Amino acid sequence: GKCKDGLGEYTCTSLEGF
Amino acid sequence: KPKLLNKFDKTIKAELDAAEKLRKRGKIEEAVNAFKELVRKYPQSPRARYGKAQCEDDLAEKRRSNEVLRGAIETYQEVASLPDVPADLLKLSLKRRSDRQQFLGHMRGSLLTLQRLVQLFPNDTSLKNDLGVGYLLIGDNDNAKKVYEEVLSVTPNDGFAKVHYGFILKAQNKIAESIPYLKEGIESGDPGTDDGRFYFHLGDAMQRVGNKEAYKWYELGHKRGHFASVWQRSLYNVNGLKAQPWWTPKETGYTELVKSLERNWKLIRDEGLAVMDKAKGLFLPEDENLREKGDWSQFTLWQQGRRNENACKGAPKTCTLLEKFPETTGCRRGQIKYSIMHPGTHVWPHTGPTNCRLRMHLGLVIPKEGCKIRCANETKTWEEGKVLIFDDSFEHEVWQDASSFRLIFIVDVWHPELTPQQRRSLPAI
Ligand SMILES: CC(C)(NC(=O)C(=O)O)C(=O)O
Ligand SMILES: [Br-]
Ligand SMILES: [Mn+2]
Protein backbone atom coordinates (compact mmCIF):
# COMPACT_ATOMS: atom_id res chain seq x y z
CA GLY A 1 0.00 0.00 0.00
CA LYS A 2 1.41 3.37 -1.09
CA CYS A 3 0.78 7.08 -0.56
CA LYS A 4 0.10 8.46 -3.96
CA ASP A 5 -2.31 11.35 -3.57
CA GLY A 6 -2.88 11.41 0.30
CA LEU A 7 -1.57 10.02 3.54
CA GLY A 8 -3.57 6.90 4.34
CA GLU A 9 -0.94 4.36 5.22
CA TYR A 10 0.69 4.26 8.60
CA THR A 11 4.08 4.85 7.01
CA CYS A 12 4.51 6.21 3.44
CA THR A 13 8.21 5.30 3.09
CA SER A 14 9.76 1.87 3.44
CA LEU A 15 12.95 2.13 5.50
CA GLU A 16 15.94 0.02 4.42
CA GLY A 17 19.04 1.30 6.24
CA PHE A 18 21.58 4.08 6.74
CA LYS B 1 16.61 0.64 38.19
CA PRO B 2 16.89 -2.49 36.02
CA LYS B 3 18.33 -5.80 37.18
CA LEU B 4 20.35 -7.30 34.32
CA LEU B 5 22.62 -9.58 36.32
CA ASN B 6 21.69 -13.16 37.10
CA LYS B 7 23.33 -15.28 39.80
CA PHE B 8 26.46 -16.14 37.88
CA ASP B 9 26.88 -12.73 36.19
CA LYS B 10 27.22 -11.15 39.63
CA THR B 11 30.38 -13.19 40.32
CA ILE B 12 31.92 -11.55 37.31
CA LYS B 13 30.48 -8.05 37.77
CA ALA B 14 33.93 -6.58 37.73
CA GLU B 15 34.93 -7.93 34.30
CA LEU B 16 31.65 -7.10 32.66
CA ASP B 17 31.77 -3.57 34.14
CA ALA B 18 35.36 -3.08 32.95
CA ALA B 19 34.36 -3.96 29.39
CA GLU B 20 31.10 -2.00 29.56
CA LYS B 21 33.25 1.00 30.55
CA LEU B 22 35.49 0.61 27.54
CA ARG B 23 32.36 0.61 25.39
CA LYS B 24 30.72 3.49 27.29
CA ARG B 25 33.83 5.67 26.90
CA GLY B 26 33.73 5.35 23.19
CA LYS B 27 36.28 2.67 22.70
CA ILE B 28 34.09 0.35 20.81
CA GLU B 29 36.72 -1.83 19.21
CA GLU B 30 38.39 -2.33 22.57
CA ALA B 31 35.07 -3.21 24.22
CA VAL B 32 33.97 -5.44 21.32
CA ASN B 33 36.84 -7.82 21.76
CA ALA B 34 36.71 -7.67 25.56
CA PHE B 35 33.10 -8.83 25.43
CA LYS B 36 34.15 -11.50 22.94
CA GLU B 37 36.70 -12.71 25.53
CA LEU B 38 33.98 -12.73 28.19
CA VAL B 39 31.69 -14.69 25.84
CA ARG B 40 34.16 -17.47 25.03
CA LYS B 41 35.22 -17.82 28.70
CA TYR B 42 31.62 -17.44 29.88
CA PRO B 43 29.56 -18.77 26.97
CA GLN B 44 26.25 -18.76 28.97
CA SER B 45 26.56 -15.28 30.46
CA PRO B 46 23.53 -13.27 29.33
CA ARG B 47 25.27 -10.00 30.30
CA ALA B 48 28.40 -10.74 28.26
CA ARG B 49 26.21 -11.57 25.27
CA TYR B 50 24.15 -8.40 25.67
CA GLY B 51 27.54 -6.68 25.87
CA LYS B 52 28.61 -8.15 22.55
CA ALA B 53 25.27 -7.13 21.02
CA GLN B 54 25.28 -3.56 22.36
CA CYS B 55 28.72 -2.91 21.09
CA GLU B 56 27.88 -4.39 17.64
CA ASP B 57 25.05 -1.83 17.67
CA ASP B 58 27.29 1.09 18.64
CA LEU B 59 29.66 0.00 15.90
CA ALA B 60 26.93 0.04 13.28
CA GLU B 61 26.52 3.65 14.39
CA LYS B 62 30.34 4.13 14.39
CA ARG B 63 30.73 2.92 10.77
CA ARG B 64 27.14 3.64 9.68
CA SER B 65 27.15 0.09 8.40
CA ASN B 66 24.07 -2.10 8.26
CA GLU B 67 26.31 -5.27 8.12
CA VAL B 68 27.18 -4.58 11.66
CA LEU B 69 23.55 -4.16 12.70
CA ARG B 70 22.62 -7.36 10.85
CA GLY B 71 25.05 -9.04 13.24
CA ALA B 72 23.99 -7.32 16.45
CA ILE B 73 20.47 -8.60 15.71
CA GLU B 74 21.40 -12.27 15.76
CA THR B 75 23.40 -11.54 18.91
CA TYR B 76 20.34 -9.88 20.48
CA GLN B 77 18.51 -13.12 19.76
CA GLU B 78 21.53 -14.98 21.17
CA VAL B 79 20.96 -13.35 24.53
CA ALA B 80 17.46 -14.84 24.68
CA SER B 81 18.77 -18.28 23.80
CA LEU B 82 20.60 -18.39 27.10
CA PRO B 83 19.62 -19.81 30.47
CA ASP B 84 18.42 -17.76 33.38
CA VAL B 85 18.25 -14.46 31.58
CA PRO B 86 16.89 -11.81 33.96
CA ALA B 87 13.57 -10.65 32.61
CA ASP B 88 14.69 -7.04 32.45
CA LEU B 89 17.65 -7.96 30.22
CA LEU B 90 15.38 -10.26 28.22
CA LYS B 91 12.85 -7.51 27.47
CA LEU B 92 15.60 -5.03 26.56
CA SER B 93 17.50 -7.39 24.27
CA LEU B 94 14.46 -8.38 22.24
CA LYS B 95 12.97 -4.90 22.10
CA ARG B 96 16.24 -3.60 20.65
CA ARG B 97 16.28 -6.51 18.20
CA SER B 98 12.82 -5.46 16.93
CA ASP B 99 13.67 -1.75 16.87
CA ARG B 100 16.81 -2.24 14.77
CA GLN B 101 14.97 -4.73 12.53
CA GLN B 102 12.69 -1.79 11.78
CA PHE B 103 15.61 0.68 11.40
CA LEU B 104 16.81 -1.67 8.65
CA GLY B 105 13.39 -2.24 7.19
CA HIS B 106 12.82 -5.88 8.14
CA MET B 107 9.23 -5.81 9.33
CA ARG B 108 8.21 -9.40 8.85
CA GLY B 109 10.90 -10.33 11.36
CA SER B 110 10.34 -7.56 13.85
CA LEU B 111 6.80 -8.91 13.83
CA LEU B 112 7.89 -12.28 15.17
CA THR B 113 10.31 -10.76 17.66
CA LEU B 114 7.43 -8.68 18.99
CA GLN B 115 4.98 -11.61 19.01
CA ARG B 116 7.50 -13.52 21.10
CA LEU B 117 7.96 -10.52 23.42
CA VAL B 118 4.20 -10.48 24.02
CA GLN B 119 4.12 -14.22 24.66
CA LEU B 120 6.94 -13.80 27.21
CA PHE B 121 5.45 -10.75 28.94
CA PRO B 122 1.68 -11.13 28.66
CA ASN B 123 0.88 -8.41 31.18
CA ASP B 124 2.99 -5.62 29.60
CA THR B 125 0.61 -3.37 27.68
CA SER B 126 3.43 -1.46 25.93
CA LEU B 127 4.55 -4.62 24.18
CA LYS B 128 1.05 -5.16 22.85
CA ASN B 129 1.10 -1.58 21.61
CA ASP B 130 4.52 -2.01 19.90
CA LEU B 131 3.11 -5.20 18.36
CA GLY B 132 0.12 -3.34 16.93
CA VAL B 133 2.72 -1.05 15.39
CA GLY B 134 4.71 -3.91 13.89
CA TYR B 135 1.43 -5.10 12.36
CA LEU B 136 0.80 -1.69 10.83
CA LEU B 137 4.28 -1.53 9.29
CA ILE B 138 3.46 -4.48 7.06
CA GLY B 139 -0.04 -3.26 6.28
CA ASP B 140 -1.80 -5.93 8.35
CA ASN B 141 -4.43 -3.62 9.65
CA ASP B 142 -6.95 -6.22 10.86
CA ASN B 143 -4.52 -7.84 13.33
CA ALA B 144 -3.23 -4.49 14.56
CA LYS B 145 -6.87 -3.58 15.24
CA LYS B 146 -7.45 -6.68 17.36
CA VAL B 147 -4.26 -6.00 19.26
CA TYR B 148 -5.46 -2.53 20.13
CA GLU B 149 -8.87 -3.98 20.99
CA GLU B 150 -7.30 -6.30 23.55
CA VAL B 151 -5.16 -3.46 24.93
CA LEU B 152 -8.23 -1.20 25.32
CA SER B 153 -10.21 -4.22 26.64
CA VAL B 154 -7.84 -4.04 29.58
CA THR B 155 -6.58 -0.48 29.78
CA PRO B 156 -9.10 1.73 28.21
CA ASN B 157 -7.44 5.03 29.06
CA ASP B 158 -4.25 4.02 27.25
CA GLY B 159 -3.88 6.91 24.81
CA PHE B 160 -1.36 5.25 22.50
CA ALA B 161 -3.77 2.45 21.79
CA LYS B 162 -6.57 4.98 21.40
CA VAL B 163 -4.84 7.00 18.70
CA HIS B 164 -3.77 3.85 16.88
CA TYR B 165 -7.26 2.40 17.14
CA GLY B 166 -8.53 5.69 15.76
CA PHE B 167 -6.03 5.81 12.89
CA ILE B 168 -7.10 2.26 12.01
CA LEU B 169 -10.81 3.07 12.12
CA LYS B 170 -10.34 6.16 9.97
CA ALA B 171 -8.28 4.29 7.37
CA GLN B 172 -11.30 1.91 7.18
CA ASN B 173 -13.72 4.84 6.53
CA LYS B 174 -15.18 4.63 10.05
CA ILE B 175 -14.88 8.40 10.20
CA ALA B 176 -17.24 9.18 13.07
CA GLU B 177 -16.21 6.18 15.19
CA SER B 178 -12.55 7.20 14.81
CA ILE B 179 -13.01 10.77 15.93
CA PRO B 180 -13.34 10.16 19.71
CA TYR B 181 -10.40 7.75 19.84
CA LEU B 182 -8.17 10.17 17.94
CA LYS B 183 -9.17 13.10 20.14
CA GLU B 184 -8.89 11.24 23.43
CA GLY B 185 -5.57 9.71 22.40
CA ILE B 186 -4.03 13.05 21.53
CA GLU B 187 -5.18 14.90 24.64
CA SER B 188 -4.16 11.98 26.84
CA GLY B 189 -0.68 13.42 26.03
CA ASP B 190 0.84 9.97 26.63
CA PRO B 191 4.08 8.81 25.00
CA GLY B 192 3.36 8.09 21.36
CA THR B 193 0.31 10.32 20.95
CA ASP B 194 2.07 13.57 19.91
CA ASP B 195 2.30 12.57 16.25
CA GLY B 196 1.38 14.44 13.09
CA ARG B 197 -0.56 11.52 11.65
CA PHE B 198 -3.16 11.65 14.39
CA TYR B 199 -3.66 15.39 14.13
CA PHE B 200 -3.81 15.19 10.31
CA HIS B 201 -6.42 12.43 10.29
CA LEU B 202 -8.54 13.73 13.20
CA GLY B 203 -8.88 17.02 11.32
CA ASP B 204 -9.74 15.29 8.06
CA ALA B 205 -12.38 13.18 9.87
CA MET B 206 -14.00 16.33 11.22
CA GLN B 207 -14.00 18.15 7.85
CA ARG B 208 -15.73 15.10 6.46
CA VAL B 209 -18.47 14.99 9.05
CA GLY B 210 -19.09 18.71 8.99
CA ASN B 211 -17.53 19.65 12.34
CA LYS B 212 -15.90 23.08 12.39
CA GLU B 213 -12.99 23.06 14.78
CA ALA B 214 -11.09 20.63 12.64
CA TYR B 215 -9.07 23.68 12.11
CA LYS B 216 -8.59 23.73 15.87
CA TRP B 217 -6.61 20.68 15.56
CA TYR B 218 -4.71 21.68 12.47
CA GLU B 219 -3.39 24.83 14.10
CA LEU B 220 -2.38 22.95 17.24
CA GLY B 221 -0.41 20.47 15.14
CA HIS B 222 1.20 23.59 13.65
CA LYS B 223 1.98 24.54 17.27
CA ARG B 224 3.73 21.23 17.97
CA GLY B 225 5.95 21.11 14.89
CA HIS B 226 4.13 18.49 12.77
CA PHE B 227 2.69 20.76 10.03
CA ALA B 228 4.66 23.52 8.30
CA SER B 229 1.40 25.57 8.45
CA VAL B 230 -2.35 25.17 8.98
CA TRP B 231 -3.07 24.76 5.22
CA GLN B 232 0.16 22.95 4.23
CA ARG B 233 -0.14 19.67 6.13
CA SER B 234 2.30 17.26 4.52
CA LEU B 235 4.41 15.05 6.73
CA TYR B 236 7.45 13.82 4.71
CA ASN B 237 8.94 17.28 4.28
CA VAL B 238 12.28 18.97 3.61
CA ASN B 239 12.03 22.13 5.70
CA GLY B 240 12.37 25.57 4.09
CA LEU B 241 11.40 24.68 0.52
CA LYS B 242 9.41 27.56 -0.92
CA ALA B 243 5.77 26.84 -0.09
CA GLN B 244 2.93 28.26 -2.15
CA PRO B 245 -0.33 26.67 -3.35
CA TRP B 246 -0.05 27.85 -6.94
CA TRP B 247 3.01 28.28 -9.11
CA THR B 248 3.59 29.46 -12.66
CA PRO B 249 5.79 27.71 -15.22
CA LYS B 250 8.40 30.44 -14.80
CA GLU B 251 8.39 30.10 -10.98
CA THR B 252 9.45 26.43 -11.40
CA GLY B 253 12.04 26.77 -14.22
CA TYR B 254 10.72 23.53 -15.77
CA THR B 255 9.66 25.51 -18.81
CA GLU B 256 10.91 23.08 -21.43
CA LEU B 257 8.55 20.51 -19.90
CA VAL B 258 5.47 22.73 -19.75
CA LYS B 259 6.18 23.64 -23.38
CA SER B 260 6.56 20.03 -24.48
CA LEU B 261 3.31 19.22 -22.71
CA GLU B 262 1.34 22.10 -24.15
CA ARG B 263 2.69 21.81 -27.65
CA ASN B 264 2.15 18.04 -27.82
CA TRP B 265 -1.00 17.84 -25.74
CA LYS B 266 -3.29 16.35 -28.46
CA LEU B 267 -0.96 13.34 -28.77
CA ILE B 268 -1.23 12.85 -24.99
CA ARG B 269 -4.99 13.23 -25.02
CA ASP B 270 -5.46 10.87 -27.94
CA GLU B 271 -3.36 8.13 -26.33
CA GLY B 272 -5.40 8.42 -23.18
CA LEU B 273 -8.61 8.31 -25.17
CA ALA B 274 -7.46 5.16 -26.85
CA VAL B 275 -6.76 3.61 -23.50
CA MET B 276 -10.25 4.57 -22.39
CA ASP B 277 -11.85 3.01 -25.51
CA LYS B 278 -9.84 -0.23 -25.98
CA ALA B 279 -7.95 -0.78 -22.72
CA LYS B 280 -10.16 0.74 -20.00
CA GLY B 281 -8.89 -1.63 -17.36
CA LEU B 282 -5.52 0.15 -17.31
CA PHE B 283 -7.47 2.95 -15.63
CA LEU B 284 -7.87 2.00 -11.94
CA PRO B 285 -10.13 3.64 -9.38
CA GLU B 286 -8.72 5.76 -6.60
CA ASP B 287 -8.10 3.49 -3.57
CA GLU B 288 -7.04 6.07 -0.99
CA ASN B 289 -10.57 6.93 0.23
CA LEU B 290 -10.42 10.56 -0.92
CA ARG B 291 -13.90 10.77 -2.44
CA GLU B 292 -17.17 11.68 -0.84
CA LYS B 293 -18.98 10.40 -3.94
CA GLY B 294 -18.42 9.84 -7.59
CA ASP B 295 -16.22 8.05 -10.12
CA TRP B 296 -12.47 8.74 -10.43
CA SER B 297 -9.83 6.54 -12.05
CA GLN B 298 -6.13 6.76 -12.82
CA PHE B 299 -3.91 5.35 -15.55
CA THR B 300 -0.39 5.43 -14.15
CA LEU B 301 2.75 5.59 -16.33
CA TRP B 302 5.41 6.46 -13.67
CA GLN B 303 5.25 5.90 -9.89
CA GLN B 304 8.13 6.50 -7.51
CA GLY B 305 10.29 7.20 -10.54
CA ARG B 306 9.99 3.78 -12.11
CA ARG B 307 8.50 3.53 -15.51
CA ASN B 308 5.67 1.04 -15.91
CA GLU B 309 6.57 -0.68 -19.16
CA ASN B 310 3.30 -2.50 -19.62
CA ALA B 311 1.55 0.81 -18.89
CA CYS B 312 3.49 2.75 -21.51
CA LYS B 313 2.34 0.15 -24.04
CA GLY B 314 -0.91 2.10 -24.16
CA ALA B 315 0.68 5.56 -24.23
CA PRO B 316 4.02 4.96 -26.02
CA LYS B 317 4.46 8.35 -27.66
CA THR B 318 3.66 10.11 -24.40
CA CYS B 319 6.10 7.99 -22.41
CA THR B 320 8.72 8.55 -25.09
CA LEU B 321 8.15 12.32 -24.93
CA LEU B 322 8.50 12.35 -21.15
CA GLU B 323 11.71 10.28 -21.11
CA LYS B 324 13.59 13.46 -22.05
CA PHE B 325 12.58 15.18 -18.80
CA PRO B 326 14.12 13.47 -15.74
CA GLU B 327 12.75 16.22 -13.47
CA THR B 328 9.49 14.19 -13.49
CA THR B 329 10.49 10.66 -14.57
CA GLY B 330 12.87 10.52 -11.57
CA CYS B 331 10.59 12.17 -9.11
CA ARG B 332 10.59 9.25 -6.75
CA ARG B 333 8.07 11.34 -4.75
CA GLY B 334 5.51 11.62 -7.46
CA GLN B 335 3.85 10.04 -10.44
CA ILE B 336 2.90 10.63 -14.07
CA LYS B 337 -0.65 9.51 -14.85
CA TYR B 338 -3.93 10.10 -16.68
CA SER B 339 -6.80 10.97 -14.38
CA ILE B 340 -10.39 10.63 -15.46
CA MET B 341 -13.15 12.07 -13.30
CA HIS B 342 -16.77 11.66 -14.15
CA PRO B 343 -19.74 13.79 -13.15
CA GLY B 344 -21.16 13.58 -9.67
CA THR B 345 -17.75 13.46 -8.02
CA HIS B 346 -16.56 15.33 -4.90
CA VAL B 347 -13.05 14.84 -3.50
CA TRP B 348 -12.80 15.63 0.17
CA PRO B 349 -10.33 18.27 1.21
CA HIS B 350 -7.01 16.54 1.55
CA THR B 351 -3.24 16.87 1.33
CA GLY B 352 -0.45 14.85 -0.28
CA PRO B 353 2.32 13.20 1.67
CA THR B 354 5.06 15.59 0.72
CA ASN B 355 6.13 19.14 -0.05
CA CYS B 356 9.02 17.66 -2.12
CA ARG B 357 6.97 17.71 -5.29
CA LEU B 358 5.01 20.10 -7.39
CA ARG B 359 2.08 18.74 -9.37
CA MET B 360 1.36 19.65 -13.00
CA HIS B 361 -2.09 19.13 -14.57
CA LEU B 362 -2.45 19.25 -18.35
CA GLY B 363 -5.99 19.74 -19.49
CA LEU B 364 -6.91 17.01 -21.99
CA VAL B 365 -10.72 16.78 -22.07
CA ILE B 366 -12.27 19.57 -20.00
CA PRO B 367 -15.99 20.38 -20.11
CA LYS B 368 -17.32 23.89 -20.48
CA GLU B 369 -18.47 23.82 -16.85
CA GLY B 370 -18.69 21.64 -13.72
CA CYS B 371 -15.02 21.06 -13.14
CA LYS B 372 -13.11 22.99 -10.55
CA ILE B 373 -10.33 22.61 -8.01
CA ARG B 374 -9.65 24.68 -4.93
CA CYS B 375 -6.19 24.83 -3.41
CA ALA B 376 -5.85 26.87 -0.20
CA ASN B 377 -8.47 29.64 -0.76
CA GLU B 378 -8.01 30.03 -4.58
CA THR B 379 -10.38 27.99 -6.83
CA LYS B 380 -9.31 27.31 -10.44
CA THR B 381 -10.20 25.69 -13.77
CA TRP B 382 -8.54 23.33 -16.19
CA GLU B 383 -8.06 24.23 -19.84
CA GLU B 384 -7.61 21.90 -22.80
CA GLY B 385 -3.95 21.91 -23.80
CA LYS B 386 -2.83 24.16 -20.92
CA VAL B 387 -0.94 23.31 -17.73
CA LEU B 388 -1.88 24.28 -14.16
CA ILE B 389 0.60 23.78 -11.28
CA PHE B 390 0.20 23.53 -7.52
CA ASP B 391 1.73 22.24 -4.24
CA ASP B 392 -0.54 19.34 -3.38
CA SER B 393 1.13 19.47 0.02
CA PHE B 394 -1.52 22.12 0.64
CA GLU B 395 -5.13 21.39 1.35
CA HIS B 396 -7.08 21.05 -1.88
CA GLU B 397 -10.58 19.99 -2.95
CA VAL B 398 -12.18 19.10 -6.28
CA TRP B 399 -15.64 18.98 -7.83
CA GLN B 400 -16.93 17.48 -11.06
CA ASP B 401 -20.50 18.51 -11.79
CA ALA B 402 -20.41 18.64 -15.58
CA SER B 403 -22.44 16.50 -17.98
CA SER B 404 -19.62 14.44 -19.47
CA PHE B 405 -16.14 13.23 -18.46
CA ARG B 406 -13.04 15.23 -17.51
CA LEU B 407 -9.59 13.93 -18.45
CA ILE B 408 -6.41 15.54 -17.18
CA PHE B 409 -2.77 14.43 -17.24
CA ILE B 410 -0.81 14.71 -13.97
CA VAL B 411 2.97 15.16 -14.05
CA ASP B 412 4.84 15.53 -10.77
CA VAL B 413 8.17 17.33 -10.57
CA TRP B 414 10.81 17.57 -7.87
CA HIS B 415 10.45 20.83 -6.03
CA PRO B 416 12.79 23.28 -7.82
CA GLU B 417 14.98 24.19 -4.77
CA LEU B 418 16.01 20.50 -4.20
CA THR B 419 19.62 19.43 -4.77
CA PRO B 420 20.72 16.58 -7.07
CA GLN B 421 21.84 15.03 -3.78
CA GLN B 422 18.35 15.39 -2.21
CA ARG B 423 16.91 14.08 -5.50
CA ARG B 424 19.05 10.92 -5.61
CA SER B 425 18.76 10.32 -1.84
CA LEU B 426 15.26 11.00 -0.40
CA PRO B 427 13.36 7.76 0.19
CA ALA B 428 10.70 7.17 -2.44
CA ILE B 429 7.04 7.90 -1.83
C1 LIG C 1 -7.85 16.92 -9.69
C2 LIG C 1 -7.53 15.67 -8.94
C3 LIG C 1 -8.42 15.03 -7.90
N1 LIG C 1 -6.19 15.70 -8.55
C4 LIG C 1 -5.76 15.93 -7.23
O1 LIG C 1 -6.45 16.12 -6.31
C5 LIG C 1 -4.30 15.90 -7.12
O2 LIG C 1 -3.60 15.80 -8.15
O3 LIG C 1 -3.75 15.89 -6.01
C6 LIG C 1 -7.65 14.80 -10.07
O4 LIG C 1 -8.63 14.69 -10.77
O5 LIG C 1 -6.82 14.02 -10.48
BR1 LIG D 1 29.32 -19.87 31.39
MN1 LIG E 1 -5.25 15.69 -4.49
Could you explain how this protein is built, in words?
The complex is a heterodimer of chains A (18) and B (429). Chain A is largely without helices or strands and 18 residues long. Chain A contains no helices and no strands. With 429 residues, chain B is α+β, with helices and mostly antiparallel strands. Chain B folds into 2 domains: 7-224, Tetratricopeptide repeat domain (Serine Threonine Protein Phosphatase 5, Tetratricopeptide repeat, Alpha Horseshoe); 249-425, B-lactam Antibiotic, Isopenicillin N Synthase, Chain (Jelly Rolls, Sandwich), CATH 2.60.120. Helix content of chain B is 52%, strand content 15%. In chain B, strands 1, 3, 4, 5, 7, 10 and 12 form a 7-stranded antiparallel beta sheet that branches. Chain B has a 5-stranded antiparallel beta sheet with strand order 2-6-11-8-9. The structure holds N-oxalyl-alpha-methylalanine (UQK), bromide ion and manganese (II) ion. Manganese (II) ion (MN) is lined by residues 350, 392, 396 of chain B. Chain B: Disulfide bonds join 312-319. Chain B: It catalyses: L-aspartyl-[protein] + 2-oxoglutarate + O2 = 3-hydroxy-L-aspartyl-[protein] + succinate + CO2. Chain B: Glycans are attached at residues 123, 377.
Give the biggest beta sheet of chain A: none
Oligomer: heterodimer
By helix and strand content of chain B, what is the structural category? alpha+beta
- The share of residues in helices of chain B is 40-55%
Gross morphology of chain B: elongated
Enzyme class (chain B): oxidoreductase
Protein name (chain B): Aspartyl/asparaginyl beta-hydroxylase
TPR repeats (chain B): 12-45, 125-158, 160-192, 196-228
GO molecular function (chain B): calcium ion binding; electron transfer activity; peptidyl-aspartic acid 3-dioxygenase activity; structural constituent of muscle; structural molecule activity; transmembrane transporter binding
Describe this structure in a few short sentences.
With 18 residues, chain A is largely without helices or strands. Chain A has no helix or strand.
